[PDB]
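Form P-L/3: holo structure prediction, ligand fe (ii) ion.
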Amino acid sequence: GLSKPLLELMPTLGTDAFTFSPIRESTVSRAMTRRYFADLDAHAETDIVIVGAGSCGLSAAYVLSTLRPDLRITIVEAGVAPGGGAWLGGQLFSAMVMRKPADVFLDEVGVPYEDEGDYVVVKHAALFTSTVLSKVLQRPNVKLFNATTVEDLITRKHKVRIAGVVTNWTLVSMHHDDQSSMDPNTINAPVIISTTGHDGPFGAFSVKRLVSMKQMERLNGMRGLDMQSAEDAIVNNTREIVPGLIVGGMELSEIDGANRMGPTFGAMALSGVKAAHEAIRVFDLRKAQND
Amino acid sequence: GLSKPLLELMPTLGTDAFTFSPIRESTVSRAMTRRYFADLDAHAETDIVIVGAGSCGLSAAYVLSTLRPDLRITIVEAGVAPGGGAWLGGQLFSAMVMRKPADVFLDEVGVPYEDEGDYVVVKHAALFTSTVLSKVLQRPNVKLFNATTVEDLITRKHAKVRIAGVVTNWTLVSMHHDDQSSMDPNTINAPVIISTTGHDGPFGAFSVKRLVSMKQMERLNGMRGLDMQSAEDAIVNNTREIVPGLIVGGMELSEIDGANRMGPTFGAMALSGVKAAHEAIRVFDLRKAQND
Amino acid sequence: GLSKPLLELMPTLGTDAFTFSPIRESTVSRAMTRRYFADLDAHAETDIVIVGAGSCGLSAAYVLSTLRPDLRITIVEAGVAPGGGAWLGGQLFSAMVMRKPADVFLDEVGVPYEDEGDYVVVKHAALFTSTVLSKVLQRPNVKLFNATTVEDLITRKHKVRIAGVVTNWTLVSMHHDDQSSMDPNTINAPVIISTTGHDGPFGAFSVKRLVSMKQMERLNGMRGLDMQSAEDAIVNNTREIVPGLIVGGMELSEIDGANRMGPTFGAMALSGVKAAHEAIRVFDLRKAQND
Amino acid sequence: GLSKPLLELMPTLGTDAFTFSPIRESTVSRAMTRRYFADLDAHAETDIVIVGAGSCGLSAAYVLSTLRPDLRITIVEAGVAPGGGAWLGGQLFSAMVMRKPADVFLDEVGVPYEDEGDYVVVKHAALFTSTVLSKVLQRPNVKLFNATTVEDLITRKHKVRIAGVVTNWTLVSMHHDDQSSMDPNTINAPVIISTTGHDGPFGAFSVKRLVSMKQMERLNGMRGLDMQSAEDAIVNNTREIVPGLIVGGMELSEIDGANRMGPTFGAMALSGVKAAHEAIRVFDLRKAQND
Amino acid sequence: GLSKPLLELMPTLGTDAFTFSPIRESTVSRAMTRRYFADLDAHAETDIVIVGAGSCGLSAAYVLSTLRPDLRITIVEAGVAPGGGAWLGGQLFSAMVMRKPADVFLDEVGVPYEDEGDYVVVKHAALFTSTVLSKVLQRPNVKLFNATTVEDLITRKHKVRIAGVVTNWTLVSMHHDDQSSMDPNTINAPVIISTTGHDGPFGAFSVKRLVSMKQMERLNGMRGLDMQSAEDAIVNNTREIVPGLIVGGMELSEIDGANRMGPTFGAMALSGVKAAHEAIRVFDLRKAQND
Amino acid sequence: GLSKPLLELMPTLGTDAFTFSPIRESTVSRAMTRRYFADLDAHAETDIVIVGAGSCGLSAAYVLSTLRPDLRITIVEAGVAPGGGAWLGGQLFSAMVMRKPADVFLDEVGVPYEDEGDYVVVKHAALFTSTVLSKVLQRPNVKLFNATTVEDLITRKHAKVRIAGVVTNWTLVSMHHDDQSSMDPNTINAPVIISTTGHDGPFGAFSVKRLVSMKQMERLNGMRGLDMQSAEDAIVNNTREIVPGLIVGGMELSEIDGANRMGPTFGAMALSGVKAAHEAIRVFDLRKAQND
Amino acid sequence: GLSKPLLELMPTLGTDAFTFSPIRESTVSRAMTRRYFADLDAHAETDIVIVGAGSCGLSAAYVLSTLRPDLRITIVEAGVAPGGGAWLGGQLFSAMVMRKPADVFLDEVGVPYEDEGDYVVVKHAALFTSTVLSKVLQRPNVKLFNATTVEDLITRKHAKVRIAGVVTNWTLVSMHHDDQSSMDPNTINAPVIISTTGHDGPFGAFSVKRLVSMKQMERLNGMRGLDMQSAEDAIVNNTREIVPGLIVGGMELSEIDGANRMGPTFGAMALSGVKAAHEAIRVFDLRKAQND
Ligand SMILES: [Fe+2]
Ligand SMILES: [Fe+2]
Ligand SMILES: [Fe+2]
Ligand SMILES: [Fe+2]
Ligand SMILES: [Fe+2]
Ligand SMILES: [Fe+2]
Ligand SMILES: [Fe+2]
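OUTPUT (holo model):
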């Protein structure tokens, strides 16, 4: 049941006996700003940046921060609420289906499921996302800059190497026409993991920018749905696309022209894992090239 | 560190040695549709409904499902992503400030914080919401119907009315009752309905605004100015059954009561939800008897 | 005249003597969800999927389900209301004009008309569409999923073969930016009939998808209006375009680069009959390939 | 099975042997215009106008044209497709629930159903709608002006009497700003049956217009959902609200402050039957005054 | 001064002595539809069609109807108000400037002006347009179908020959999404004069359509503003682009890749004069081929 | 047949022989700006202002300028193309129906028609509008400020007020008073304003609605149902000075008066403008005196 | 301290002892139109035109009018408010960072800063823009046509072309060539045109995008990733006459050269402006001749 303290408080609610401690509005403001600037300052030069906090990005943020408490992890998520397209299953339904061996990841992060043999099923996709999300955030080396969009990549010569991200408020990135000029800010980082999902108004950002930066010819383009070949491809091909830039999740399907998997998350999760692994493998090198 | 099983799997990713088990698409479909219908069939008739998965509603769901595992709790949230305004702090910033004694609740749900004196600060608003959400979604007596909007209330006579459930529909359908032909809603019968849809706005403050148009209220006193000290006490202390079968809490309450807003501080949303759950339990049997 | 039971009921309406049997909301909600998820389950794996419930789609569904009571036909229509663009004639006018021998089909589905010589005229385009819709829906093996949009195609290797469709609620398909990620659902099928009208926000989906999937050179494009050359072209060329994918109706004009016919439905109707014949010709084989 | 004629034509589809009879585009334009304007001419002055071709209106239309084949019935429907909100059940599902004795009506029009006791269930709302639609449109005295909106009512003194409708193309009604002035057209009629659903951008037209013309104190507005009291109310209180104006269906709930029922069409059917009945009762009187 | 009849009526206004003759709404309705049907029926098959009632098209309509009373001239104008960009000069100002010898045309149509030497200035652009428009509309052989758009062209083999235009209500052409399918209407003609202004949403229709029909490599595109080199170009090159299709006005600039003149209308007027000539030159031959 | 000069020019078109006289863009620019700003200067202070170049406003302007060549007439029309809803008949059809004795006016403005006994029919609404528009613009004492919107009224005391001019701006600016930073309007002082802006709507019934928001009117009775027979009479017969310096006519009148609507018929609009012009003249001297 | 005249006036405010001098609306209207025409008439044919009043354009305008009081400078700014993206720093913040020697330019226009070694910081970007802006507008040979958009260019031959002016229109009109009937643009003839319209977007990078649509450029390399060190030197040292009559600078140049972007750092903009003004002088006599 409930904790004794909370049980002792409840009877108090709705009576003169209950009242919150005194507060001045400036206190709250400063409590927030002082802390946000701290983060903003400390992450202007970070170790690893993760663009897009969906099922894949979060799964990467988890593995990475657990194996490397020594590294600073800056997650830049466009929406106010993180989680990408993992709050639902298919056609607005709830059940999250993960084909084995993705269950190995569900165990790791402590997310229950029904075993069906070749695949497992999480009660609600929300349960998976909220749980993983909750744990990632507990990590002292992780910072979630939600409500923030990546408008461009910080580049360098040698062919180019990605060395950071150009950020701004998601709402600003969306109205660069509905106001006067609003310049973005930056984040210097040796390694960037992009998991912004597939092509769309917001998705497939890093992969599409490489093309506009005339570094890529074109995008093969996410192909039709074929669960069996899709998940396999996304997970095994998750890697450093260009120096300093690692791609995973469905964004990868855009650059590689892989099939899509529809309402099944095994690949996203393990692709998250693969990406964290890649970041580690490539880190020391890019770190040297960035300093 | 990571678990052995995962540490052993990692080296496999990126090699021909890795492959997911076989799967036929329709197995995925049926896997979801089967379970979803079950929910839809089971919750068509439920015990308690909570409208609005914002910080207040979630806190209510937590306390309620914990205290009454015997009760079926149906959470209906408009957005795909649940959490309301609990994903951020103030002005798009992160820090979640909670005035004491709300820290008692934080301890209850296991959410770390920095003791600052009269108030405490949670590293990130997101840290609180995901934790509570995670714990709530783990109770076997709770179901989250996200991307689902409450378009109306199910009423009963005693011209006074009793709220006996909600009229539902896919949020996307609610937002486009013009861009298409007629799309009727669905229903959920329930003895007690908790409404925590936040304050007035395109989507928010549904129940309260509906009571007015159903001609059960003279109008809404409307949310007033920001005064944290008087706002949080007012909200928490007055969470209650506003009309038979309907309890209001959170910022939706400020609209009918005409209370001040508190802005970027979540103590009241948490304890108001605690009180919302307490009220539900106090009233359940009575409404449950009246409803059947 | 009316039936006696109804004539007997009428005097009742408007009096205390009239009342509906008792009911509980949960009863109705269950009557619906139970039956829907039942279809949803039974059609996850189907025999023939018809994309687009317009004059062509409908015509094909009619002939098909009539000739093969054994096959399960899944009609996936985008709009809430079916009927495509066959509710009107031209420029918001009613009269539906069909050139012979399209009248043989109008005789099949029992739709009255005026014989003007080389063509026949249906009183209102709505008379055809409603009658046909009514008859197709009465078939025990036909299921209509209206408000459901086809977002992609389920593919398989060998060049590719179409093995089904990727589905979602039309209102979701239209707002993949007005919310967080919302994954689609799916339906497996050996043969898919696509009749989604010519290019536009909604139309010519299959053929456009074949291009964006990098399976087609480009769309020849729907050409000018020339009824005589157009109708013969749509009808005589309706066929399996790729293993498992049959295209007819005006969508066909997008890939074949045929002329348009404006306000005349003979071709749409007979293209439907042709599409039906094609599904049958090609069925057993694609079926074997898909199991 | 199919008809021999159609079975004999099918093999021909897809061969040089097949070809549509000669045609010239101007023949198709004239075929439609000549007819559409014949209707415009005959209906400019009609016997009964029914606004909104939804389940309630379509039902009323069915009974009115069958009982009085002598009267000209003019149906004005805003949408391109008629049927209102009777193409689906609730939350986009298909099953149409009808509480008894509404099954007597389903018997009348020939729409099959499963008997569940107090209520019967029609396979798919569309089957009911398309079926009834087909029959109404078959009547020689009925005319469906779809894609046409009622923007106002024609009035006369003695308080006022409703004597017709002000019409226009729906698209014009929706864009009285996106262009220069576009005047409406007219249809004189002694009795007007308004069945345009509950309030919304399109709905509850005549009921709201009475208010704006300062004839009504206001709209009590549709109340909460309560199937048992809503349907009994809507059906029993369908009547002539003002001389010349008979309101039924869900539009009546706005002026009466009646509860809503949701995904159940029992009332819409019988309110329609009763609206038609009231039409007949009041016809001679209004016709005498209108002339 | 006013006319005696009017002067005698005036004092009557605002007194009980003034009243309009008896009317019934249906009378007015029938007065319009009957004449519109007549027009819609007589023009389904016409001699010459002019797309776009702007300064250029209108000039062409004038000259063409005046030199050939025997021919039927069908003007299809998208906007509700005809005139295109000739209701104003540049930057919302009023003065209409025409370089000589354009003044020769102004003399012809009876439009006063100030001579400045190389150019003449018309008091207000509206003056020119209202006068030409008034004279064009007076001709017994001219019909103005405004509020109507040309969505496509009618084609014939032999490369293709333009034999008419696909029409629809402008509002319907702008919302082929915001509703169900709405088929267009047709008009057969041996020669079509397109003067739909330069590129944009509505503009440069026929030229752009020649590309989408794979008849043109691309549009050279309207170039920079060089009044002196542009107007001569527009005028001297106005001619039959494809058999049956004459392009003039600024639309011509799109296909020829010519400079623009901005706020000066000599070219437009003389281009129209030229257009009418081409139609006459080419008429008998096209007429022959089209029948 | 065509003129000889034109007939001699046609053969030239299409040959290297045809060419336009020399020109410098700036010459054209100055040709326009000079004249326009001349208009702005002269009309800033005018005699009579007509807001709304519709069938009623145009008829009023025609009668006014013809009976009073001495007065300066300033027409302010929101649309780029003037003519309001006088380009079409009903439901996008052409024919323009005018009941008698409006035909007396059609003879005045030189517009042909088919006599049907109790009413006459003009070939195309457009014929009427373009013809009248043409004869109005020709008068030397009239200026047409198209693409210009009247956003407010200029007032003076005798609390009762007197309308003494219009507040103006480019229509495009009137519709985007958010889509940019602040954009102040301009002004036109005038002792008499004839407002003929049609019935309520985004653009319509400007003055009548403004009188209300200026708290000089209780509320608009609002345009009523359609009844041609009683509507036209009421519109023509009650056209007049509603308030000192403000004459209202056409369909804007039905909004304040609460009169029926006539739909696809124009007799009343035409004779209303005629009455509007008669009233301006009756009232002019008095208002002018007060205004100076 | 304030001025004595103002100090003596204040006590008057809020008493019957205060009142403005008499006025008649028409007077204010004529005071504005009269002057606007003067400008419109004098600039139709001008010396140097600067498209885009952003930081770069503004800087160019300053340097140019200060070195050539004899030249008439016509600035066309699409927005109501000038200044471009120079009202803020990055992510909506204030501080304007300029890397040296860009500080030389701030000393010239009198804008304070904190020296930080290799760079300096102007309190708020608004200080730089407002100061520069103020100083530029004071110049008697400068004219700011704000709320005005360059829809196209004036071209001449020597298929090589020369730029000889700009096709103009009210910005709001430029944005609605579909929301009305045809609205022709006006013109401005000039020998040299400095285009500084920021980088690609609905309004940005105009001349550059136009050179391509006019079929004078193979394509646009497109602005590349953010790399401040290579970006700023590149934009500044490559600012030049791209085509006879057209000088390009600021961030627009990045579109045509495929140079890196610099983000929230304005050093390059200011010195790119100085460079553009300089190029215009170097090129002026020659183009002036070619234009007459
Ligand atoms: Fe930028
Ligand atoms: Fe509804
Ligand atoms: Fe997706
Ligand atoms: Fe109107
Ligand atoms: Fe079409
Ligand atoms: Fe203002
Ligand atoms: Fe233009």
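COMMENT: Residues C 198 surround fe (ii) ion (ligand 5) (CB under 6 Å).
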